[PDB]
Design a protein around this nucleic acid. Structure first.
Lengths: 497, 23, 103
DNA sequence: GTGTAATCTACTGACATCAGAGTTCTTAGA
DNA sequence: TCTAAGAACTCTGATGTCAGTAGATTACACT
C-alpha cells in the first residue's frame, strides 16, 4: 500500500466460561493466553510503531458496551494509538485472581452471535478518521463450531463475513488447544482466507521483537546529468542507517508537563534582544579578524545545484576497499519525473555488469552542499531463496575519500613470521570458523534501554536485564579452540609475560 | 504473500531471532 | 478542621479510595502534594510502589502507615524530608551544617 | 458583477544530518 | 618538581527533506 496508511488491528476474545475458566492441564489458560498475547503484541507495537492503531473487545460477556447491536459484547478499548494506560487496563484481568476480577465486572458464559460481533467491529473501524493500509481482526476463540446449531443463525455470520472481506477489511484466526480436538474444516473454513494441536503461528506473537520499523521512503530525488543536457530522475534510498535512542523530551518536575526550551540572544552590556540581522559571523587568523554575514557563511560552501554529474568509468578492482567514507546508499529509478528514463537506467545497469565497470559521479544531495565523489557500482538480485529478495537490483553509491581525509599514520617495517608460525595459526583460524549473517547481532545498549524504559513505564517489578550477544562466550572459545594458545606461548615468544 | 511477512508488523520482513557466534 | 493546614502531605498511593484520601485531607485542609520535594513533612502510601522504593533507596523522607492520614484525622501528625547534592568546591554545605546540623 | 471550477502553495510529521557544545585523555609539561 | 593543548566520543538543535492534506487564489465563464 501507499506510504501514510496506518496498520490498524483489533483483538476480539471469546469471554465464554467453557474456554475462559478452562484447562486440561493447570499450566496455561486460554483467556490467560489470549490476554498475554494482546499485552505482548501491544508492547511490541508500542516500541516499534506508536503510529499504528490497536483495539480490544470481549464478546459473549453479560454486561455490555457498544455503539449499537449491543447484546452480550463489551468493547474494552476502542481504536487508539497505543500506550501505557491501555497495557495497564489489560494487566488487571490476567492470572488466577484475574479470572475472578473479570467476573465481578462483565460476567461469563452467556449466549453470543458472530454476525453481531463482526457488525460491532465493523462499526469500530468505520468510526475512525485516519487512513488505514491494513485492516485486520484477530479471533481468540476456541469454539470451532461457533454455535451454528441454528444454520440460519450461522448463514448470517458467513454472509456478514463475506461483507467484511468484500469491504476490504481482512480477518485472521488463532485456535487455542480445545480439549480433544479442533478442526477448521468443520467451520471457519470459509471465514479465513488437516487437524491441529495449537497454532504454530501463535508463538510469533510472543517474539517480543523490538526496533523501529520505518517503511520504504526516499531520502531525496536527483537528476543524473550525463552531460549539459541528458538527465534521468533517480531515487536515493537508505538501506543501512544507524539507529539512536529516541530524542529525550525535557519536563517540568512538579507536574511532569512538557516545557519549552525558549532560547534568545542578549547583548552582554544592554537589554537588546538581538535579532538575527544584528550579528554577523567571524574568524581569527594572523592576529586579524575576518567578518562575514549570516547569508554568506553559507554562500561559501556552495558549488552546484542538486543532481549527479557523470565523470566517466573505471575498473571495479581500482576502487580499493580499504578507504571507505560513510555508509553506502542505494540508487533506484523514479518515473515520478523524467518519464521513460527507466528504459535508459535499465540498459545502463545491465551493460555495466558485462563491462566489469563502475560509473564515477559527483554528488550533491541538496543546494548549499559541496560535491562529494561517488562510484556507482552496479547490482544484481539473489531471488533464489523463493523470491525473498536479500538484495535489490540497482546501483550502490559508494563514496570516495579526498586527500584531507586519509590521515598520516606512523612509520613501521617488518616481515617477521616463519611458515610454522603461519602454519599453527592456519589451524586455530580454521577451528574458529562460523557463519556471520548481517542480522545475527543486536545493540546491547539500545536493547537494554527499552527494557529499562518498560520497567519505568508499566511500574513493573524488575528491569528484564536480558544479557547481550556481543560478549564472546569465553568457555566455548576455551573448549572449541582447545589448549592451542600454548603454540604461540612456546613456538613464537619467550616466557617473560 | 505470507512466507516472509511478519504477523506482528505486516508488510515488513520477519525479524529472525538474533543469532550470535556458535560453531 | 484547621489543624492540618500548614502541614504538607504526599499521598503517593492508596488501594480504601486513594483520590478520597486527599479529599478527606482537604476538609481537614492538609496541604496536598503529588510528588514530595525536600519541603514536605511526610509521605503517605496505602501500599508500596517503585517511587516508594526510590524513597527507601533515597533516605530522603518520612514514610508513614496508610492510617496516619486517616488517624492524623484524630491527631495532628506532621513530620519531614530531603533531595540530593554532595559538594566540595571549597566545601560549603557541611560547614553551613556545622552551624545548621548537630554533627 | 457573481459563481464554480481547477491548482498552486502552503504546513506538519517524520527522518537525516551537519555543525556546535559538553566531556575525558594524551603529550608538553615550573 | 606537573598545567593546557591538542585529541577523542556523545549529545543536542537547526536546516532541509518527503508525502500528504487542504486551504485560498485565481483563474473561466455567463449572452
Amino acid at each position: 500500500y501507499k506510504y501514510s496508511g496506518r496498520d490498524s488491528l483489533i483483538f476480539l476474545v471469546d469471554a465464554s466460561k467453557a474456554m475462559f475458566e478452562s484447562q486440561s492441564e493447570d499450566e496455561l489458560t486460554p483467556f490467560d493466553m489470549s490476554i498475554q498475547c494482546i499485552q505482548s503484541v501491544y508492547i511490541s507495537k508500542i516500541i516499534s510503531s506508536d503510529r499504528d492503531l490497536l483495539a480490544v473487545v470481549f464478546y459473549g460477556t453479560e454486561k455490555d458496551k457498544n455503539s449499537v447491536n449491543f447484546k452480550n459484547i463489551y468493547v474494552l478499548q476502542e481504536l487508539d494509538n497505543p500506550g501505557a494506560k491501555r497495557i495497564l487496563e489489560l494487566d488487571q484481568f490476567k492470572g488466577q485472581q484475574g479470572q475472578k476480577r473479570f467476573q465481578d465486572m462483565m460476567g461469563h458464559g452467556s449466549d453470543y452471535s458472530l454476525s453481531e460481533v463482526l457488525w460491532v467491529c465493523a462499526n469500530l473501524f468505520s468510526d475512525v478518521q485516519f487512513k488505514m493500509s491494513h485492516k485486520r481482526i484477530m479471533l481468540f476463540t476456541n469454539e470451532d463450531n461457533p454455535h451454528g446449531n441454528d444454520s440460519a443463525k450461522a448463514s448470517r455470520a458467513r454472509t456478514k463475513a463475506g461483507d467484511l472481506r468484500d469491504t476490504g477489511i481482512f480477518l485472521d484466526l488463532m485456535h487455542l488447544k480445545k480439549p480433544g480436538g479442533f478442526d477448521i474444516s468443520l467451520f471457519y473454513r470459509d471465514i479465513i482466507s488437516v487437524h491441529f494441536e495449537e497454532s504454530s503461528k501463535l508463538e510469533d506473537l510472543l517474539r517480543k521483537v523490538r526496533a523501529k520499523e520505518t517503511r520504504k521512503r526516499a531520502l531525496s530525488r536527483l537528476k543524473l546529468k550525463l552531460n549539459k543536457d541528458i538527465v534521468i530522475s533517480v531515487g536515493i534510498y537508505n538501506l543501512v542507517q544507524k539507529a539512536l535512542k529516541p530524542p529525550p523530551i525535557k519536563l517540568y518536575r512538579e507536574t511532569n508537563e512538557p516545557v519549552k526550551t525558549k532560547t534568545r540572544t542578549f547583548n552582554t552590556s544592554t537589554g537588546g534582544l538581538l535579532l538575527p540581522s544584528d550579528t554577523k559571523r567571524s574568524q581569527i587568523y594572523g592576529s586579524r579578524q575576518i567578518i562575514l554575514e549570516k547569508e554568506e557563511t553559507e554562500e561559501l560552501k556552495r558549488f552546484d545545484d542538486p543532481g549527479l554529474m557523470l565523470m566517466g568509468f573505471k575498473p571495479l578492482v581500482l576502487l580499493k576497499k580499504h578507504h571507505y567514507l560513510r555508509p553506502s546508499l542505494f540508487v533506484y529509478p523514479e518515473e515520478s519525473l523524467v518519464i521513460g528514463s527507466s528504459t535508459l537506467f535499465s540498459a545502463l545497469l545491465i551493460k555495466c555488469l558485462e563491462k566489469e565497470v563502475a560509473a564515477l559521479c559527483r554528488y550533491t544531495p541538496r543546494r548549499n552542499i559541496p560535491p562529494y565523489f561517488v562510484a556507482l557500482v552496479p547490482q544484481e538480485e539473489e531471488l533464489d531463496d523463493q523470491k525473498i529478495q536479500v538484495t535489490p537490483p540497482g546501483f550502490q553509491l559508494v563514496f570516495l575519500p579526498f586527500a584531507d581525509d586519509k590521515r598520516k599514520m606512523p612509520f613501521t617495517e617488518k616481515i617477521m613470521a616463519t611458515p610454522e608460525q603461519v602454519g599453527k595459526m592456519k589451524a586455530i583460524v580454521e577451528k574458529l570458523r562460523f557463519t556471520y549473517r548481517s542480522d545475527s547481532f543486536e545493540n546491547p545498549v539500545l536493547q537494554q534501554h527499552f527494557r529499562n524504559l518498560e520497567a519505568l513505564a508499566l511500574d513493573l517489578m524488575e528491569p528484564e536485564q536480558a544479557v547481550d550477544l556481543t560478549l564472546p562466550k569465553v568457555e566455548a572459545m576455551n573448549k572449541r579452540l582447545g589448549s592451542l594458545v600454548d603454540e604461540f606461548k612456546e613456538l613464537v615468544y619467550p616466557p617473560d609475560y | 504473500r505470507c512466507p516472509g511477512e511478519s504477523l506482528i508488523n505486516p508488510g515488513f520482513k520477519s525479524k529472525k531471532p538474533a543469532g550470535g557466534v556458535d560453531f | 478542621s484547621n489543624i492540618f493546614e500548614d502541614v504538607e502531605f504526599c499521598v503517593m498511593s492508596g488501594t480504601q479510595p486513594k483520590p478520597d484520601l486527599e479529599n478527606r485531607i482537604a476538609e481537614f485542609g492538609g496541604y496536598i502534594v503529588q510528588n514530595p520535594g525536600p519541603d514536605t513533612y511526610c509521605v503517605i502510601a496505602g501500599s508500596e510502589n517503585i517511587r516508594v522504593k526510590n524513597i527507601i533507596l533515597s533516605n530522603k523522607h518520612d514514610v508513614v502507615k496508610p492510617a496516619w492520614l486517616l488517624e492524623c484525622f484524630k491527631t495532628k501528625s506532621f513530620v519531614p524530608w530531603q533531595p540530593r547534592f554532595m559538594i566540595h568546591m571549597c566545601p560549603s554545605t557541611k560547614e553551613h551544617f556545622a552551624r545548621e546540623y548537630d554533627c
